[PDB]
């Protein structure tokens, strides 16, 4: 679990969005596993606007932060799950690191701000949904 809170927006994994997220929907994209909902309160977070390929993520299944080197946002094949058929997920960045399904939502940050959230993983890999291209989150 986990979310990004920037301005009047809440960014979550689309597959973990609640009834209230859908009732306050701003934008969603199944191909990216992202959903953004509106908030009444002003959020705590800053979005990175950079091309960093290293950073630190929070791993809830270890209660620890880990440093990672990750690939540039790209189209990656993701096996079928209960949430989605087998498909290519776009804007996904992979890294070697521990992750379990419940780790989705953990934030990846670099020195500039929030980069993205945990969205996929397995076999010593962790995948992050990028949010740095979503310039409208800042206005
Ligand atoms: C494949 O199972 C996982 C997952 N689950 C997912 O990646 N997915 C399930 C949720 C939607 C994701 C997506 N964005 O489509 C895919 C995450 C971390 C670790 C593992 C594990 F180690 F068990 F293999
Ligand atoms: Zn950066």
UniProtKB/Swiss-Prot annotation:
Residues at which Zn(2+) 1 binds: 50, 52, 110, 112
Enzymatic reactions: Selective cleavage of Tyr-|-Gly bond in the picornavirus polyprotein
Lineage: Viruses, Riboviria, Orthornavirae, Pisuviricota, Pisoniviricetes
Annotated protein name in UniProt: Protease 2A
Organism of this sequence: Coxsackievirus A16 (strain G-10)
Active-site residues from the entry: 15 (for protease 2a activity), 33 (for protease 2a activity), 104 (for protease 2a activity)
Subunit composition and interactions: Homodimer.
Top-rank lineage group of the source organism: Viruses
Cited function: Cysteine protease that cleaves viral polyprotein and specific host proteins. It is responsible for the autocatalytic cleavage between the P1 and P2 regions, which is the first cleavage occurring in the polyprotein. Also cleaves the host translation initiation factor EIF4G1, in order to shut down the capped cellular mRNA translation. Inhibits the host nucleus-cytoplasm protein and RNA trafficking by cleaving host members of the nuclear pores. Counteracts stress granule formation probably by antagonizing its assembly or promoting its dissassembly.
């Amino acid at each position: 679990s986990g979310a990004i809170y920037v301005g009047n927006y809440r960014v979550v994994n689309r597959h973990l969005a609640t009834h209230n997220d859908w009732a306050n929907l701003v934008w969603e994209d199944s191909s990216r596993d992202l959903l953004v909902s509106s908030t009444t309160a002003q959020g705590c977070d800053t979005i990175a606007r950079c091309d960093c390929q290293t950073g630190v993520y929070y791993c809830s299944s270890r209660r620890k932060h880990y440093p990672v080197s990750f690939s540039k946002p790209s189209l990656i094949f993701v096996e079928a799950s209960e949430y989605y058929p087998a498909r290519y997920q776009s804007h996904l960045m992979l890294a070697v690191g521990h992750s379990e399904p419940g780790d989705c939502g953990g934030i990846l940050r670099c020195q500039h701000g929030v980069v993205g959230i945990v969205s996929t993983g397995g076999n010593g890999l962790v995948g992050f949904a990028d949010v740095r291209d979503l310039l409208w989150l800042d206005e």
